Structure formats: C-alpha cells, structure tokens
Design a protein around this ligand. Structure first.
Ligand SMILES: *[C@@H]1O[C@H](CO)[C@@H](O[C@@H]2O[C@H](CO)[C@@H](O)[C@H](O)[C@H]2NC(C)=O)[C@H](O)[C@H]1NC(C)=O
Ligand SMILES: *[C@@H]1O[C@H](CO)[C@@H](O[C@@H]2O[C@H](CO)[C@@H](O)[C@H](O)[C@H]2NC(C)=O)[C@H](O)[C@H]1NC(C)=O
Ligand SMILES: *[C@@H]1O[C@H](CO)[C@@H](O[C@@H]2O[C@H](CO)[C@@H](O)[C@H](O)[C@H]2NC(C)=O)[C@H](O)[C@H]1NC(C)=O
Ligand SMILES: *[C@@H]1O[C@H](CO)[C@@H](O[C@@H]2O[C@H](CO)[C@@H](O)[C@H](O)[C@H]2NC(C)=O)[C@H](O)[C@H]1NC(C)=O
Ligand SMILES: *[C@@H]1O[C@H](CO)[C@@H](O[C@@H]2O[C@H](CO)[C@@H](O)[C@H](O)[C@H]2NC(C)=O)[C@H](O)[C@H]1NC(C)=O
Ligand SMILES: *[C@@H]1O[C@H](CO)[C@@H](O[C@@H]2O[C@H](CO)[C@@H](O)[C@H](O)[C@H]2NC(C)=O)[C@H](O)[C@H]1NC(C)=O
Ligand SMILES: *[C@@H]1O[C@H](CO)[C@@H](O)[C@H](O)[C@H]1NC(C)=O
Ligand SMILES: *[C@@H]1O[C@H](CO)[C@@H](O)[C@H](O)[C@H]1NC(C)=O
Ligand SMILES: *[C@@H]1O[C@H](CO)[C@@H](O)[C@H](O)[C@H]1NC(C)=O
Ligand SMILES: *[C@@H]1O[C@H](CO)[C@@H](O)[C@H](O)[C@H]1NC(C)=O
Ligand SMILES: *[C@@H]1O[C@H](CO)[C@@H](O)[C@H](O)[C@H]1NC(C)=O
Ligand SMILES: *[C@@H]1O[C@H](CO)[C@@H](O)[C@H](O)[C@H]1NC(C)=O
Ligand SMILES: *[C@@H]1O[C@H](CO)[C@@H](O)[C@H](O)[C@H]1NC(C)=O
Ligand SMILES: *[C@@H]1O[C@H](CO)[C@@H](O)[C@H](O)[C@H]1NC(C)=O
Ligand SMILES: *[C@@H]1O[C@H](CO)[C@@H](O)[C@H](O)[C@H]1NC(C)=O
Lengths: 595, 272, 295
C-alpha cells in the first residue's frame, strides 16, 4: 500500500509483457536482415509499430508514479528510463514536421549524387564512388573536386533543414525539463542519487577537455609526422608550418586516417603480420574462426556459446539464392537467444571482427540476468569497448602463434612493432580530435553560443585550432560543411566513440596488470588468465543496474575517465615520433588558408 | 550341514503403476492448475525412472534415490506442470521466488523427488505457444501443497477494483511465451513432483522385489513372502487349499510352503 | 436421488438360533488332521441372531416388510442371507455414513462387485430396484439410489463385467450366502461361502467353513453397517417414486462375533469339517481340555 510496491508491481508486469513483444520484433528484424523480401519487411514494420505502440502505452501509466517518493535505486532507474517523454512533449504539427525533416535529411544523405560536369551520367550514390576516390587516390585535383562536390551538392542543401532541426530539438529539450539538446545528449552519462559516485552532466565537458589537453602532445607529434610524410608525396601543396588540407586525409570527412598508412609507413620493406594467406593454406572456414573465438573467450573465464548460437547464426553468406545484409552485427533477441549476423570470409579483418562480435555477445549474456530496462551497457561506450579490447588482445603475435597461424620461429622485430603502433595510432588517435571538435560544435550550436550565422566560420576556426585541418576552398556562410557526415545527418551522438576510445585502453591496462604481464602494453594478451576474466565479469554483470563510475572502479579502480592508459600504450611510438621530429617543426599554425 | 545360499522369492510383479501415463502424458496442465494424481495401489518401480538418462534435475529430498525401492508407503501424489527452465530451481524446499510462493510451494520438510526434463521438442511451436500460464500476483504467500484457481483481478492500490483493469488493477494470470528458437532457461521444462506420506493405514505401494534362483536339493536359507528358516526344499504332494500359503504340522512347525510364482507346494526338511 | 419408502408394515424384531455357523479359516495355514485350537474372534454356537424379513402378501392384509436398518458393528458381523433371487446386492460400512468421514461401499449393480472407499452421502433407505417391462420383456436393473455424491475417493476396485440373473422365481429358497466381516488391523477381511438349501422356515442347520475372499487394506473405522436390498417395479402396483413397490422371498441374518476359544478340526485335505465352542458347556470345556472329540 505504497508507491514503492505499486511501482514494483507495475515494473514486474511491464518486464513480463515487453519481453515477448521485443523478442517478436527482434525475430522479425532477423528474418528481414537474413532474407530481403517484400513480405519480411512488412512483418518487420508491423512488429516495430506494435513495439512502439506498446512502449508509448506503457509511458503514461508509468508517468503517474512520482519519482521523488522512491527509495529503491533499481526501481527509480527503471522508471526514469521508462518515463522518458522524448518526442511526446510537442504539438501534432510540430512533431510531424520534425519527423518529416528528419526523414528528408536521411533520404538526402542516403541517395547522394555525384553528377560530374560535362557528363550526363556517372552520378553515383553512397555506393562505391567518392569513397575510393578520396581513399586510394593521390591526385590533388580530383580529390579537391570530390570534396567540393559532396559538400556543395549534398551540403548547403541541408542548411535550412538543419536549422529547423536544431530549433525543434532545442524546443523539445527545453520542454522536457532539460536544457538545450546538448544537455539531453549528455544526460546519458548522468549519475544522481548515489553518494560519492554522482556524476554531474556538465562535468563531462570538463573531463573531455582535460583528457584532450593531455592527448594534444601525441596528436601534435603524429600530425607533424603525417605532414612531413605528406610533403614528400604532395610537393608544393602543404607547408611544413601550416595545417593539413581537408581532402588529403584519406577520407571525405577526415574521420579515420587509415588510408594514410600506405604513404606514412616508416619501414616500407618490413611486412606486417597479415596471416590471411596462412589460413587459406589449411582447412579454415567461418566455423573454425568462431570456434577459435570461443576457445579464446573460454580461456579467460567466460562461458561457452549457447546451443542456439551455432544452429541459428548465419556465419556464412548464403549466396545469390537469397539476399542478406553482410554488415557484422550481434543480435540480442531478449529470451536467451544470442546469434551473430556476419558474412565471415577467410581474411584476418573478419577474424578480429568475429572476436569483436563475440565480445558483444558475451556482454549481452552477462547482463541478461537483469530486468529488461537494465539489460544494456552502462554507457554508450562500454558495449563497443568490450569487443574492441578483445580485438586488440587477439591481434597480437603471441596469440597468433599460440593458435597456430603464425610460425613459432617468427622473430618479433621492433620495426614491425613501430608499424603496427603507427597503424593503431592512425586508426584510433586520428579520430579523437575530430570527434571532440564535432561534438563541441554540436554542443555549442545547440546551447546557443554560436548564433544562426557564423556556423561554418567558427567550425573552420575550431578545425584549424583544435584539429590540424584547413579547408582548401573558402566556404561562405551558405554552405553546410558539418552536415556532410552520417551521424549528424541522422541525429546520432558522437562522443560515444571518444568515450569508447578512452575506456578501451583503461580496460586493457587493468586486465593486463591483473594477469601479471611484463613488458609493453601493446603486446599484452588476455589469455589463459582467469583473474582478469573474473575482474571483467564483475563489471559485465552490472549493466545499467549500477552507475558507470562504480563499474569503472570495479574493473579498473578509478571513478573518472583517465587518459594515462592511452599514453602508456603509445609511448613506444611517442618516443620514436619525438626522435624523428627532431629536424622538423612540431605543431601547426593558423593563417595559412590555401586560397 | 551349515546353510550357504539365498533363494529369497516373491510373487510376480504385475500392474506396475500409472507412472507410464503420468510421465509420458501428451497434455500437461499449467503451474497454477497443477494436476494431482493419486498413486496408491501399484508397485512403484523407481529404478526405471532413476536409471533413465533423460531427466535434467533429479533430486530426492528426505530419501535416497537408491532406497526408493526398499520402502513402503500409503499414497503417492504426482503433481505435473510445465514451468520455465531458469525457475526449475525454485521447485525445492526452502526456496523462494515467483513460482514458489505464488504458484506452487513445497514444505520445509519434504519426502520425495523432483523430476524435470526439457520439452522443447513438443511443447513449442513457431510463432509462440501461449497455452501455458502462471500466476504472477497475489495478496499473500501460498501454503505448502496449495492450489488456487481464482482469477479475480489484483488490487495494488487503494482504489477498489470493480471487475475491470485500471491504474493498479492487473490480471492475475499471465501467459508464457515458448518459441522453438529460445535458449536454455526460457524453454519449457515438464517438472513432476512426487510426494511420499505415511499415516495410520496399511501401506499399499512398496519396493518391487522380483525373485531369486530357486534351489531344491540343498541346505538353503529361504524367504517366501516374509517367512524364513533353513532347510532343503523337496517337492511334496500335499495339495493345499487355493488360499493357504504355508502349512504347519503338529507342534506348530513350518514344514511346507507354496512358491508364490509357480504355485507349487514343497516340503521343508531341516539340514543334517 | 434419495427417495424414501412408505407403505411398510412394522413388526416386532424376530430372533432365531445359529446352531453351528460362522466358523471361518482364521489363518492361511495348511493342516491335515491335526485338530488345531485357536484363540480368535468367532460366532458362538447356538447364539441369538436377528431375523429380518422381506415379504409381500396380496390383498389388503398380510405384511409389507422391507427391513434394512443401520445395525451396529461390534468386532465383526456374520451375514447370512437365504436368497431365492438376486435381492441382497451389497452392504454399507462406516461410522458416520455422511460426508464427514469415509465409508466402504461393496455393492453389486448387476454388472459385478464394486468396492469403493470415498465420502458418500447415504440416504435413509438405499436400494437398487429392478424393472420388469412388457416390451422387451426381461428383468433389467435400472435403479441406483444408494448415495447422492462421491468425493475424495481413496480406494476403488471394479472387476470384469458380468451378467445377472434378475429372474424373480417363485417357490422355495435355492442357495445360501454367508459372509463374515472383520476389521482389526486396517485390513477388511471378508469370508464368503455358498451352500445350496431348499428350506423356507429359518436358517439352515449344519456346518460350513467360510473361506477368505478378499483382504482390503482400507484403514477406515467401522462401527455400524447397513444392508442394501433390491426392489421390484412393475405393473399391478401403481404409485409414486416412494410407493408402487413390491418385493418378497428375501431374508438375512446378522450375528455379532466375540473373543472365544474354538477347537477346529481339519480333514486329510485341509478343510474344516467340525468344531466345538469351549465356552458353551462343561462338556465342550472338557473336550477342549483334553483336545479330542472322543470323551
Ligand atoms: C530494490 O528492490 C529489489 C527487489 O527486491 C531488491 O533486490 C533484492 O536484494 C536482496 C539482497 O541482495 C535479495 O536477497 C533479493 O532477492 C532481491 N530481490 C529480488 C526480487 O531479487 C533491492 O535490494 C532493493 N534495493 C534496495 C532495498 O536498496
Ligand atoms: C593457453 O594454455 C593452453 C594449455 O596449456 C596452451 O595450449 C598448449 O600450447 C602448447 C604450445 O604450442 C602446446 O604444445 C600444447 O599442446 C597446447 N595444449 C593444449 C591442450 O592446447 C595455449 O598455447 C595457451 N595459450 C597462450 C596464449 O598462452
Ligand atoms: C515413455 O516412452 C518411452 C519410449 O516409448 C519409454 O522408454 C522405454 O522404456 C522401456 C522400459 O525401460 C525400455 O525398454 C525402452 O527401451 C524405452 N524406449 C526408449 C525409446 O527409450 C519410457 O519408459 C516411457 N515412460 C515411462 C514413465 O514409462
Ligand atoms: C508368474 O510368472 C511366471 C512366468 O511367466 C508364470 O509361469 C508361467 O505359467 C504359465 C501358465 O502356468 C506357463 O504356460 C508358462 O510356461 C510359465 N512360465 C514360466 C517362465 O514359468 C506364472 O504362472 C505366474 N504366476 C502367476 C500367479 O501369475
Ligand atoms: C424423506 O427423505 C428425506 C431425504 O430424501 C429424509 O429427510 C430427513 O428426515 C430426517 C427425519 O426423518 C431428518 O432428520 C433429516 O434432516 C431429513 N433430511 C434432510 C436432508 O432434511 C427422510 O428420509 C424422509 N423425510 C420425510 C419428511 O419423509
Ligand atoms: C455398474 O457400476 C460400474 C462401476 O460404477 C459401471 O462401470 C462403469 O460404466 C460406465 C458406463 O457404463 C463406464 O464409463 C465406466 O468406465 C465403468 N467403470 C469401469 C471401472 O469400467 C457399470 O456400467 C454399472 N452397470 C450398471 C448396469 O449400472
Ligand atoms: C527467404 O524468402 C523466400 C521468399 O519466398 C522464401 O522462399 C525462402 O524460403 C526464405 N528463406 C528461408 C531460409 O526461409
Ligand atoms: C511528460 O509529459 C507530461 C505531460 O505531457 C508531464 O506531465 C510529465 O511531467 C512529463 N515527464 C517528464 C518531463 O519527465
Ligand atoms: C565448453 O565446451 C568445451 C568443448 O565442447 C567443453 O570441454 C567444456 O566443458 C564446455 N564448458 C562448459 C562450462 O560446459
Ligand atoms: C630496434 O632494435 C635494434 C637492435 O639494436 C636497434 O638498433 C634499433 O635502433 C631499434 N629500432 C627502434 C626504432 O627502436
Ligand atoms: C434372543 O433375544 C430376545 C430378545 O429379548 C429374546 O426374547 C429371546 O428369548 C432370545 N433367544 C435366545 C435363544 O436367547
Ligand atoms: C425396451 O427397453 C427399454 C429399456 O431400455 C424400455 O425403456 C422400453 O420401454 C422397452 N420397449 C421398447 C418398445 O422400447
Ligand atoms: C480425503 O480424506 C483423507 C482422509 O484422511 C484426508 O487426509 C484428505 O485430506 C482428504 N482430501 C480431500 C481433498 O478432502
Ligand atoms: C476409529 O479409527 C480411527 C482411525 O483413523 C481413529 O482415529 C478413531 O479414533 C477410531 N474411533 C474410535 C471411537 O476409537
Ligand atoms: C481328499 O482328497 C482326495 C484326493 O484329492 C480325495 O480322493 C478325497 O475324496 C478328499 N476327501 C475329502 C473329505 O475332501
């Protein structure tokens, strides 16, 4: 006869009634993804509509229960996750126009149009096109042409659409008892009602800034090295004091610097550790890949895969008889059925993606012992970092030679180590300043520190000060440069990748010092160590039942987001970069617009 | 002549038990409406149930599984019902949860066994098997071996529930979702509970003892349906009455017994 | 279901003598001319048993008797029925004879013996009448008014079906059915015997050892029993459900047992052919003292 008991009864009823509906929706989505037909999409849409209607119906009944008369933390968290109004505190016309704007921006981004001049054809879509033109080409002219065409044709076309989107999102966020939409996006890292472990929502900005201030030296050295190696490839196009151009970063937006490894490789005569040809020389297939992944996971302490996992997963492309999306995904249906959708080839990248997806599945099976509203990761960065640390620990030469791929007589030269560290740097640290700049720009454009004008001006001034990127063509206040990405054109958060990057190295160091491993961190294998397995399982059980700070303290021993593990990981490369940049200029300067 | 032998004999073992119909039943009841079947007058052979390697959980409380065929009882109750796999552990003495105190509870002291096996082969259809239900809400905990079929709507708030659902008026019965693709733990597990009791009444179900090889020309130790002694069993000619089992000569001495299986009569002579 | 039976002439209770009857086999032991002496519950020789009549004389005279009272059950009873046709078709055993406790029902419904131990609600006058029609003219058993409901059944036993000779013959008695019931250790012991006789006056005089028939483990307590009879419903006797009846050629004797000492005599094959009651006269006292029938 109290609010707590009524809330617990309602929560039990909801947890019982929502599991079957979510399982049916997930089953329909699986049948669609594994079989692209006109009937499966209809069933998927029907199941999605039913689940959305059920979730919206179980939101006004839960809205009647107040949150200030509850002493149990689990019930409070479940109700706070359930009483989320979201897009309901608006008007009919307002919500309809917002959905229309979102859908039309998504369609404008998904369609795309190359439409080269003096050519009535060859106007390609987001399929192979500008991607490989900006990725594996060395011509300045065509790179600049593509970077200008994608930003002028699928760019400024979304300027008023994005303005109205920002206005409507700010209206929704202010009407939802919150600050600007940036606060609504940062609300995921908020922890209240716990003594000592409380994490303010505004402290995330300060933490990200303090971590970036310590990342700055490594990124400046990496930028200097990349610029020095790029001046030898693009003569009379980049100054050794200025900033790097935008269209010479091996990507349309400059997010990842993976395509610059073929140009910035220090020891071009030393081959990598690619064991792709070693697997085809013997009986290896997707089944063997996943068996080796299960063997790696069971060696740490994690349980075996479920029986349905092997008889329900689509580990191999069925061929042309039926069409299926070959994007590697880990499916959690919700009723003990865990399976992976992946067209696993006999390559090494797929061998690491298998470990990534199996780490996702292990996290899911770990937190599957909690209520439905809490069966999710602590933050939006833990779930991907759990697989990223496994992919890092499984890509080491020790594990490769222990499984049987690499020859036991293989010598571990330090040149290959420098090359691997530089590749990891280009693929990890290269996106940290970009992510930070993009997320700070989103936060300042949602809060209001940037007026309706001066969007691109301050965007480029930040991309010059924070990042080492400079625009090749002067863009006025009419172009829409930031909206050329996928996450911004579809209303997705971006700080999750930064948090995942900062958490994966902390997890690696914590699980490596627990396994009593000596030497550098980049060659540490989490294998045949049950202590690290138990330490990680103590964190994978929590999910959303406990704050993420408590999970970090339980798995690492810190209550904040530290960056020292990343520096400890990249120290062997940091010293080499310091020794190589002795006869060059470190850092970058502004006022070098290539106009 | 010292006796050294064992010819312990007992009559034939017929009408074993309806265990074959209570275990291999095609249809099972829900957990809130578990069926209690009376197993009273039949020779329960627990060896075929313990030796069968098709049961996941086989835990006998208050009695050893090997000594089940060495005791006599009056009535045996078989409670058959289907429950989820992850909550089979709740069917045990002293355990708590949701199915124990609201659907079916066992006493703190229990003299019996629990048998459960995975039934995902037949109790599962593509699209969902919503035929089995379970009681989710109650105003008080259930008593040991208590069954409740009342389907009145629950009342969690101060507002009276006038026969219809509302703010805090929920339906007491909730359905189970059993798909053939579910994992272990959510699959249906047909669990049967056997209860053994002893009261002031003649025991009707005992352990089935079948027979032993018969020796008819040596100094043996015999046991004919409770009798005992020592002697050689020579074939006699005393035609007993259709109901008389063992005969006694003058001075009240057991000198002739009838074999309970072949119904033949034979004399008992003391050994030299 | 419960239907009373009115229009019944009352008479004082009659008593006859059971000269030498009620002797049964006490235990399953073979004995060949040993003259065994046992100490158990038996019927005293030349005792005083009760006589229950069931007659129907035509006209506005005679007697209309249909007796089936709730007689006590003191350590066992001796039931002997001189039947001309199938009329006595079972008994009722128990203490309360209601839903408060359990009751044993051993009845014959013209199919076979039905033995059930449940909680019944027995009427004040239960019977299993017959029906004699003019079309498809054959005595059929369409009547069952013993109890109303049967809940919480513990024991049950129904053997293979069998026909029933419901022919209401007229003349003298043809056979005698003797039964000795006893419940001392939960087991309900029944000793039956069949002996043809052609007298129409009293209980036959002689000697017949009753053999064990069934040993039913029930455990319930028995303090008072009742006999179930049959009725005839035909033409020439109009009436309602509680009237329009007719019967006849039916009688049963009830004798109570008591702890006594008997000297049983076995033949060369194991059958009891003679016995003496030691507590009858000093002659039988001396006979049991010297353990012989030659004095
Ligand atoms: C909030 O309510 C839940 C639900 O009961 C509590 O969880 C219980 O925790 C105790 C102690 O670990 C267990 O013995 C119970 O089995 C748990 N309940 C269930 C249903 O599993 C939780 O402790 C409560 N939080 C508080 C009181 O702070
Ligand atoms: C983890 O431990 C297992 C078992 O000790 C190791 O497997 C052995 O590896 C050696 C080295 O090649 C072989 O000689 C043995 O035959 C293997 N035994 C078994 C049972 O597989 C495995 O190499 C270890 N892995 C790591 C990374 O240390
Ligand atoms: C349910 O049916 C199965 C199969 O019909 C029974 O298993 C048989 O048991 C007998 C008795 O031991 C064996 O001789 C057979 O070989 C078994 N067959 C199979 C296929 O295993 C089972 O005994 C039945 N259940 C019960 C309670 O009797
Ligand atoms: C107990 O079982 C045995 C074994 O079947 C029965 O012995 C059989 O009896 C029949 C008829 O008397 C014979 O035709 C068979 O040859 C016998 N077989 C054996 C192996 O002896 C015996 O009759 C049964 N007894 C009872 C009372 O059922
Ligand atoms: C008629 O039959 C009814 C039941 O069928 C009996 O009524 C009982 O009569 C006795 C007294 O003779 C009462 O003590 C009982 O309480 C009555 N029973 C019930 C259920 O009320 C009786 O056999 C006959 N009654 C009459 C009035 O003729
Ligand atoms: C006599 O009683 C017995 C037992 O009550 C009756 O046998 C039952 O008959 C019904 C329908 O005739 C069947 O559904 C049951 O299965 C029978 N019982 C058993 C144990 O087989 C019998 O029919 C009755 N006979 C008469 C003439 O009334
Ligand atoms: C995929 O869908 C087609 C559509 O008709 C169907 O024929 C086929 O059986 C489906 N594949 C599987 C594996 O069910
Ligand atoms: C959700 O909106 C309703 C009205 O639309 C309001 O009463 C309730 O407080 C809101 N809940 C929030 C903002 O958490
Ligand atoms: C996992 O699988 C391996 C190989 O099938 C087996 O040896 C091991 O016992 C399994 N682990 C568990 C916990 O069942
Ligand atoms: C690698 O090791 C050799 C071994 O002497 C050393 O000479 C060389 O300088 C090392 N290279 C780097 C980059 O540390
Ligand atoms: C039997 O008892 C009755 C009841 O008083 C009595 O009248 C009769 O004389 C008794 N008969 C014998 C033989 O004792
Ligand atoms: C036949 O017997 C039945 C009894 O089942 C009876 O009802 C009927 O009156 C008889 N006569 C005819 C012509 O059916
Ligand atoms: C049936 O009667 C027995 C007699 O002792 C009793 O133990 C049992 O509880 C009764 N069952 C029901 C359902 O009345
Ligand atoms: C009758 O027997 C029962 C056995 O359950 C016993 O409880 C009861 O006390 C007995 N009645 C009398 C009067 O002794
Ligand atoms: C005893 O049995 C024998 C053989 O079966 C038979 O000849 C004799 O008549 C029987 N005697 C009696 C009194 O039954």
């Amino acid at each position: 006869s109290t609010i707590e008991e009524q809330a617990k009864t309602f929560l039990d009823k909801f947890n019982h009634e929502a599991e079957d509906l979510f399982y049916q929706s997930s089953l329909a989505s699986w049948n669609y993804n594994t079989n692209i037909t006109e009937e499966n999409v209809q069933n998927m849409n029907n199941a999605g509509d039913k689940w959305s209607a059920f979730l919206k119906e179980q939101s006004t009944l839960a809205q009647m229960y107040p949150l200030q008369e509850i002493q149990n933390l689990t019930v409070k968290l479940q109700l706070q996750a359930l009483q989320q109004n979201g897009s309901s505190v608006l008007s009919e016309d307002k919500s309809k126009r917002l959905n229309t704007i979102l859908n039309t921006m998504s369609t404008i981004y998904s369609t795309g149009k190359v439409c080269n001049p003096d050519n009535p054809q060859e106007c390609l879509l987001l399929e192979p096109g500008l991607n490989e033109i900006m990725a594996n080409s060395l011509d300045y002219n065509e790179r600049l042409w593509a970077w200008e065409s994608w930003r002028s044709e699928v760019g400024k076309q979304l300027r008023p659409l994005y303005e109205e989107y920002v206005v409507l999102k700010n209206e929704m966020a202010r009407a939802n008892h919150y600050e600007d939409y940036g606060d609504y996006w940062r609300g995921d890292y908020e922890v209240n009602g716990v003594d000592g472990y409380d994490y303010s929502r505004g402290q995330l900005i300060e933490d990200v800034e303090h971590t970036f201030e310590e990342i700055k030296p490594l990124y400046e050295h990496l930028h200097a090295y990349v610029r020095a190696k790029l001046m030898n490839a693009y003569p009379s196009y980049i100054s050794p004091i200025g900033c790097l151009p935008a269209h010479l970063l091996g990507d349309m937006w400059g997010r990842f610097w993976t395509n610059l490894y073929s140009l910035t490789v220090p020891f071009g005569q030393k081959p990598n550790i690619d064991v792709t040809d070693a697997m085809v020389d013997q009986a290896w297939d997707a089944q063997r890949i996943f068996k080796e992944a299960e063997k790696f996971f069971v060696s740490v302490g994690l349980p075996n895969m479920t029986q349905g996992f092997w008889e329900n997963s689509m580990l191999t492309d069925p061929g042309n008889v039926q069409k299926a999306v070959c994007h590697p995904t880990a499916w959690d249906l919700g009723k003990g059925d865990f399976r992976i959708l992946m067209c696993t080839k006999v390559t090494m990248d797929d061998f690491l993606t298998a470990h990534h997806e199996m780490g996702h599945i292990q996290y899911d099976m770990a937190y599957a012992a909690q209520p439905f509203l809490l069966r999710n990761g602590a933050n939006e960065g833990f779930h991907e970092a759990v697989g990223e640390i496994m992919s890092l620990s499984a890509a080491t030469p020790k594990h490769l030679k222990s499984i049987g791929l690499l020859s036991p007589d293989f010598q571990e030269d330090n040149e290959t180590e420098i090359n691997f560290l530089l590749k990891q740097a280009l693929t990890i640290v290269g996106t940290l300043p970009f992510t930070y700049m993009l997320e700070k720009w989103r936060w300042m454009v949602f809060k209001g520190e940037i007026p309706k004008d001066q969007w691109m001006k301050k965007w480029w001034e930040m991309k010059r000060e924070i990042v080492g990127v400079v625009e090749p063509v002067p863009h006025d206040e009419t172009y829409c440069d930031p909206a050329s990405l996928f996450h911004v054109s579809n209303d997705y958060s971006f700080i999750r990748y930064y948090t995942r990057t900062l958490y994966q190295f902390q997890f690696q160091e914590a699980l490596c010092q627990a396994a009593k491993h000596e030497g550098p961190l980049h060659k540490c294998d989490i294998s045949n160590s049950t202590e690290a397995g138990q330490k990680l399982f103590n964190m994978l059980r929590l999910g959303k039942s406990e704050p993420w700070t408590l999970a970090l303290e339980n798995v690492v021993g810190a209550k904040n987001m530290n960056v020292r593990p990343l520096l400890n990981y990249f120290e062997p490369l940091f010293t080499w970069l310091k020794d190589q940049n002795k006869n060059s200029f470190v850092g970058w300067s502004t006022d070098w617009s290539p106009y | 002549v010292q006796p050294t032998e064992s010819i312990v004999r007992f009559p034939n073992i017929t009408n074993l038990c309806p265990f074959g119909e209570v275990f291999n039943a095609t249809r099972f009841a829900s957990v809130y409406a578990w069926n209690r079947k009376r197993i009273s007058n039949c020779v329960a052979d627990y060896s075929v149930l313990y030796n069968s390697a098709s049961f996941s959980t086989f835990k006998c409380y208050g009695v050893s599984p090997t000594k089940l065929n060495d005791l006599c009882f009056t009535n045996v109750y078989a409670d058959s019902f289907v429950i989820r796999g992850d909550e089979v552990r709740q069917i045990a003495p002293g355990q708590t949860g949701k199915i124990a105190d609201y659907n079916y509870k066992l006493p703190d002291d229990f003299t019996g066994c629990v048998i459960a096996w995975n039934s995902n082969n037949l109790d599962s259809k593509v699209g969902g098997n919503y035929n089995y239900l379970y009681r989710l809400f109650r105003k008080s905990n259930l008593k040991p071996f208590e069954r409740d079929i009342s389907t009145e709507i629950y009342q969690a708030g101060s507002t009276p529930c006038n026969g219809v659902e509302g703010f805090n008026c929920y339906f007491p019965l909730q359905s189970y979702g059993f798909q053939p693709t579910n994992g272990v733990g959510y699959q249906p597990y047909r669990v049967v509970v056997l209860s053994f009791e002893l009261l002031h009444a003649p025991a009707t179900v005992c352990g089935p003892k079948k027979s032993t090889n018969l020796v008819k020309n040596k100094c043996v130790n015999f046991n004919f349906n409770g009798l005992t002694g020592t002697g050689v069993l020579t074939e006699s000619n005393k035609k007993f009455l259709p109901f008389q089992q063992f005969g006694r000569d003058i001075a009240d001495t057991t000198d002739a017994v009838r074999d309970p299986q072949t119904l033949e009569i034979l004399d008992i002579t003391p050994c030299s």
